[PDB]
Amino acid sequence: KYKRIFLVVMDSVGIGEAPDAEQFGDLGSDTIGHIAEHMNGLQMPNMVKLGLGNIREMKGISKVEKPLGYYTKMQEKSTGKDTMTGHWEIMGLYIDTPFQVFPEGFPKELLDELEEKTGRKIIGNKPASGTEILDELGQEQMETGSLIVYTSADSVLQIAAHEEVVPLDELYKICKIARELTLDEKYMVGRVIARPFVGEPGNFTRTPNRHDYALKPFGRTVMNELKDSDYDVIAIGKISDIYDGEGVTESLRTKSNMDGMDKLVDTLNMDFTGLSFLNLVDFDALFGHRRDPQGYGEALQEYDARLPEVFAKLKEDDLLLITADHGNDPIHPGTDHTREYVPLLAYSPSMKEGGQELPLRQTFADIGATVAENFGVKMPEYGTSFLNELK
Ligand SMILES: [Mn+2]
Ligand SMILES: [Mn+2]
């Protein structure tokens, strides 16, 4: 049916609280809706043309009589609302065990065991930017040989040490220890990150010697199946990292949302057969977690303005899928993601009559099931394809 599928995850761009939002303390959450209200009307005319307002009408986002493609929202079935859970579900899995975040730092039980296994004390133990934590604790780390352990708003455990105090190979081994300790549901972290730095007090800089220790998806994904069947799987942005490279044939790293759209355009220009899969992370990383609705709105408007060029490049046998992985409502309390429905837009220029409303997707895995059916690869255990509906 389709030679190429272009899948775009607008990271954290949720479309209103899910039925189980209360389980997470996420009642009232509405990412796009609250941004629209803050912007006094979001300017997203191209998403509107695709049918975004037909899913839900929000300030500045109204329904259209003839949407370019098909539209609906998706409900998350997996236990957690983190990025890995969302993406793993999108590609055909079901994840019972959520990844955890640590707004007050890591539990004493974990750090005590890390201290025992490394013969070093742990300092910091809080959310912080790389720069902030080095300014505060970099000197102490140097003087003592303690390990700086910190986190972000996401499911990460970061370990900073001066390269002349803890040599790279030693820091990597420490991170591997930390990775094994954090394969535990009491404190399951998405990735352990080595954060080596150099310099002197008041002038510390992190080195390009960072290493990541991620968990692989809890199952063979639709990406695995595509790769194993000799299809192209082109990962753009954080996609390769999120899946620990599983099922990825080529990875295109990006530096911003606009760079991600440039790479999407690059893949439109490529002759491939299979999947081009983009994550636009700025929404989540720069605006959602920082609870910055203005910046979030601006980012959404910048993204929307790039879309007509994508529309112009799509072929008759190309499918464009636009969705999200969870919410991250920039006016919600705290710094965590929000449990929300995610929008789904499915567009191909071969839809000569435009689109219609699809039935609500009961799991994100419906995307994976649709991709798998299209390319004739092994169907995921979870998910219901909407491929036949796109006609
Ligand atoms: Mn995410
Ligand atoms: Mn996040």
Curated annotation (Swiss-Prot):
EC number: 5.4.2.7
Pathway named in the protein's UniProt entry: Carbohydrate degradation; 2-deoxy-D-ribose 1-phosphate degradation; D-glyceraldehyde 3-phosphate and acetaldehyde from 2-deoxy-alpha-D-ribose 1-phosphate: step 1/2
Function noted in UniProt: Isomerase that catalyzes the conversion of deoxy-ribose 1-phosphate (dRib-1-P) and ribose 1-phosphate (Rib-1-P) to deoxy-ribose 5-phosphate (dRib-5-P) and ribose 5-phosphate (Rib-5-P), respectively.
Gene Ontology CC terms: cytosol
InterPro entries the record matches: Alkaline_phosphatase_core_sf (IPR017850), DeoB (IPR010045), Metalloenzyme (IPR006124), Phosphopentomutase_DeoB_cap_sf (IPR024052)
Organism: Bacillus cereus (strain ATCC 14579 / DSM 31 / CCUG 7414 / JCM 2152 / NBRC 15305 / NCIMB 9373 / NCTC 2599 / NRRL B-3711)
GO biological process terms, semicolon-separated: 2-deoxyribose 1-phosphate catabolic process; 5-phosphoribose 1-diphosphate biosynthetic process; metabolic compound salvage; nucleotide metabolic process
Cofactor note: Binds 2 manganese ions.
Catalytic reaction list: 2-deoxy-alpha-D-ribose 1-phosphate = 2-deoxy-D-ribose 5-phosphate; alpha-D-ribose 1-phosphate = D-ribose 5-phosphate
An example molecular function term from Gene Ontology annotations: phosphopentomutase activity
Keywords: Cytoplasm, Isomerase, Manganese, Metal-binding
Binding annotation for Mn(2+) 1: 11, 325-326
Annotated localization: Cytoplasm
Name recorded for this polypeptide: Phosphopentomutase
Pfam name, any one: Metalloenzyme
